[PDB]
Amino acid sequence: GGSYVNDFIDRGRVKKVYVMSEAKYRMLPDDIGDWYVRAADGQMVPFSAF
Amino acid sequence: LGKKLLEAARAGRDDEVRILMANGADVNAADVVGWTPLHLAAYWGHLEIVEVLLKNGADVNAYDTLGSTPLHLAAHFGHLEIVEVLLKNGADVNAKDDNGITPLHLAANRGHLEIVEVLLKYGADVNAQDKFGKTAFDISINNGNEDLAEILQ
């Protein structure tokens, strides 16, 4: 969905800074399982596991 | 014209399905998610159309892009009659989707006691485990439904 992190300055003017997946990776149902979150012990777990 | 049957099947317009049907329309047509006209009618509890589609050879076990069948939808929203009609027409009672969820699993969690009864009658791996090792029973205990837990014993 995208996330408005904070603002920055572009040629003297205050603007937003956004974080979002590059199009390629948020286009298909199976792309969901391509995203990984990190557990306390430090292991990467794919979305599809939970 | 296959799309029309998809739209007409969801719109529940029984007559529309007939015409399109006769005029030779793909009974197993399919939208972007994998829904077949059978998927739609089952989902929106349109019985008369579920029958008019099965009669014309529509696949009773066509699944969507996530392994879900029409039986999964009908059992899930409590459309009892459809659950049986589909079962009498060959619906795989133990169909599993990508998450390893079965029709019993759904109907169980959603509290459709009669649908469960029927599904068991046509057979159903009461001990089937989803991708999390959960059986229709584990659900009943979790949900706190005693009537269901008993019957699922």
Strand partners, A16: A7
By the 8 A CB rule, do A24 and A39 touch? no
The torsion of the CA quartet B144, B146, B152, B153, rounded to 10 degrees, works out to: 110
Q: Mind listing the domains of chain B with CATH numbers? A: 1-153 (1.25.40.20)
Q: Does residue A15 sit in helix, strand or coil? A: strand
By the 8 A CB rule, do B108 and B139 touch? yes
With CA atoms as reference, report the closest residue to B17 among B58, B70, B75: B58
* Residue B126, Ramachandran bin (φ over 0: left; ψ between -120 and 50: alpha; else beta): alpha
By the 8 A CB rule, do B31 and B37 touch? no
Burial (CB < 10 A; 0-12, 13-18, 19+), residue B7, is: middle
Count Cβ neighbours within 10 Å for each residue of B21-58 and write b for 16 or more, e otherwise.
beeebbbebbbeeebbbbbbbbbebbbebbbbbbebeb
**Integer Cα distance of B70 and B95 in angstroms:** 10
- Determine how many CB atoms are found less than 10 A away from the CB of residue B12: 16
- Determine how many CB atoms are found less than 10 A away from the CB of residue A16: 10
**Integer Cα distance of B18 and B52 in angstroms:** 8
With CA atoms as reference, report the closest residue to B63 among B27, B39, B31: B39
Q: Does residue B13 sit in helix, strand or coil? A: coil
With CA atoms as reference, report the closest residue to B119 among B131, B133, B102, B135: B102
With CA atoms as reference, report the closest residue to B40 among B62, B18, B66: B62
By the 8 A CB rule, do B50 and B82 touch? yes
**Integer Cα distance of A36 and A42 in angstroms:** 12
Kindly provide the residue ranges of all beta strands, DSSP E only, lying in chain A, ordered along the sequence: 3-10, 13-19, 36-38, 44-46
CA separation (Å) from B87 to B35, B50, B78, B108?
19, 12, 14, 17
**Integer Cα distance of B93 and B118 in angstroms:** 10
**Integer Cα distance of A31 and A19 in angstroms:** 17
With CA atoms as reference, report the closest residue to B38 among B13, B63, B19: B63
- Determine how many CB atoms are found less than 10 A away from the CB of residue B122: 17
End-to-end, the C-alpha distance of chain B in Å comes to 48
By the 8 A CB rule, do B152 and B126 touch? yes
Tokens of A20: 């979002």
